[model samples]
Target chain A: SKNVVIYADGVYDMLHLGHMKQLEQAKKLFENTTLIVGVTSDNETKLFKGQVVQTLEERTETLKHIRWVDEIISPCPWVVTPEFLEKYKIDYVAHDDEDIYAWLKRAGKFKATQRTEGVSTTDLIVRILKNYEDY
Target chain B: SKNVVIYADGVYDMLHLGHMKQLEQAKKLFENTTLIVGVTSDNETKLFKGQVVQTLEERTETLKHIRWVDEIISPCPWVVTPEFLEKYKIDYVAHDDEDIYAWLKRAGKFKATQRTEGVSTTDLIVRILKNYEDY
Candidate 1:
């Protein structure tokens, strides 16, 4: 049996069912794979995109409690570099079929996993904004 | 110190952060409270509303793992009746100030708790549908 180390990166600010389903899909890829979650830094999210509800530490804390997640990298870079992959000895960058990370996929280092249907941060945000009372 | 048994019912289909936060809020209402979740039945959900991603058993299984959720009533009723409340020894039907359960509130059995903002089932469904490939 081969020991495979897979890497997955996300803001994971809310840490919802969609995220869990993705992790579950990643774990099923290999018989003995260690799922390493890269929780994006709050600074990076705030600078590049939008504000996150959960702080960097808070997001990491939520990831730590998940059963499928074996280890985590806090303050993880927004962009995955070759050096970052090398340092962790990551066998593959497991993610959904989204074309967001074309660099990794083109390099043959990415594993396209089945994403759990029906969830995202954007949707949650809009839902919150529109229906402030119900939540 | 009085031990309170709190009752909260929902489809709880996807069971995301919003749901967890709601349960957490319900638990904090008293010094000691048994948070009982009512998982709406699959038949009712399918007949009345949209399709659920997870089955009743799977949803219950997910709820069982949450720390705040002490117990669950699988295939729970959609409507809260006096008989159902009395059978479970429910002290309060904890919920947000949503008009969906106005009847329960009017009956004086409802306890309006602060809803966890920024997430919901409808939002998740739209997110998934619009961005199916990305997930």
Candidate 2:
């Protein structure tokens, strides 16, 4: 039998509330199915997000330890590019549909049965930061 | 007025048991006094310690809101450096004093104050990661 897997990728600096809900919802939707997480490299994060604290090793190690993740990949930052997307024949690009729908569509590998985890990572980060500052 | 300044600093990323204990001890040591915290910025932390999770801004603001701290300073990373002591006119250089005594003595601002924290940050981070995996 072929592996029925769903792939999602992100920087995932910290396991915030939004992340928890997204994983929970995604898992519920695809029960008994494997979830593959592609964590971003530290270099790529610094280049794209200005600066991030979690190193590549930390991100990968954390993902491996997560119960929800059946497998993980770190195909280098360059691998996540559009060219690599076309080359890999990758299956559904599972992500918050609102955020990555267009990009995935352009890649021509996205599955229409998309999942939308309601909350945004940016909102979670900002809220957590504000909670720390307000306290 | 004698300023009973209680000083302590660390690479407090994901706040854990060791840090909670240390801050609690420091607060008790200087009751009704001002507590000044010096958090190691990310760049300096990278130079000494390995990579960390919290950025400089994240740490500085986290310390600012703690019930125990009265003041916060983003001093040069090398807290025990001679230049820091001379420039700040600091009343006392306070810490756990486990192994930094020699440096504190050399700085000539060493105060014979002591407090015991029940846990270590290394132990805490490892414990949290383990529990997270279990969950």
Candidate 3:
């Protein structure tokens, strides 16, 4: 049987339990899955998420430590295009891609997966804001 | 077999993977262990840690979710007094108490354990600070 390749993308800053859980779920989503992570660029992350702590290179380096990740794509486009799937040989998406899902959905090249429930950067950021005096 | 009751103390403001690892380690430190976490009071934590996000009750409640935590003590003293040991009947410390460790060290009632390495509130907080613009 051919190994299935699924794309998972995120900023993955700070690399907390929530981030790990999301990755762990994606890794187990398919048997014989080749899990590829697309770490968002720092500038793009800043545009959407704002105030990203880790640089792109730094974030990509941390992804290497996770056993579930088989490969990584960075300078990974903020809005993944249909062409990206062909270029990367992506068979499916471990989760929704901002742009690629609907395109891939028509071709049945990507499957929709739910995000595992966990804390967000927003929640973690709020904690710091609440305790700004000490931190 | 006698159950060994150990005291583990922290502010546990954000409860990240690092915090969980520390708890997990302490829970397994002894064979027959009653792992008791002493959550610092807001005032005491503010005095030492500055800008604690979770209040004493909130921190204690979060501890309830951890499988490894057998019990929790809140409004726990920053300077754990000798009388505090007798009052609680703590057999050992999973890690150092700011004041209690040296005292217990002499009496042979407390054994010092190491903090498991993980991300700290300081590191996490800095992430927000560095990106204070978007967060």
The TM-score values for the models, in the order shown, are 0.52, 0.41, 0.50
Off by over 4 Å in 2: A1-135, B98-103, B106-108, B111-135
TM-score, model 3 to reference: 0.50
Off by over 4 Å in 3: A97-100, A121-135, B1-121, B130-135
lDDT of 1 by residue, A29-118 (tens): 889999899988888898898876667886786666565788899988898899999999998899776666787877778897776544
Native interface contacts retained, candidate 2:
0.00
- In the order shown, the candidates' DockQ scores are 0.06, 0.02, 0.13
2 or 3: which has the higher TM-score? Answer: 3
Q: Report clash pairs, candidate 2.
A: none
- Reference interface contacts recovered per candidate: 0.00, 0.00, 0.21
Selected candidate, larger DockQ, 1 vs 3:
3
Q: Encode model 2's per-residue lDDT on A1-135: one tens digit a residue.
A: 455566677776643334544554444444455666777777777777645545666556544534456666774443355665445444555655455356767755454334334233344334445645554
Give candidate 1 misplaced runs (Cα > 4 Å).
Answer: A98-103, A120-135, B1-58, B61-73, B76-135
lDDT of each: 0.77, 0.57, 0.72
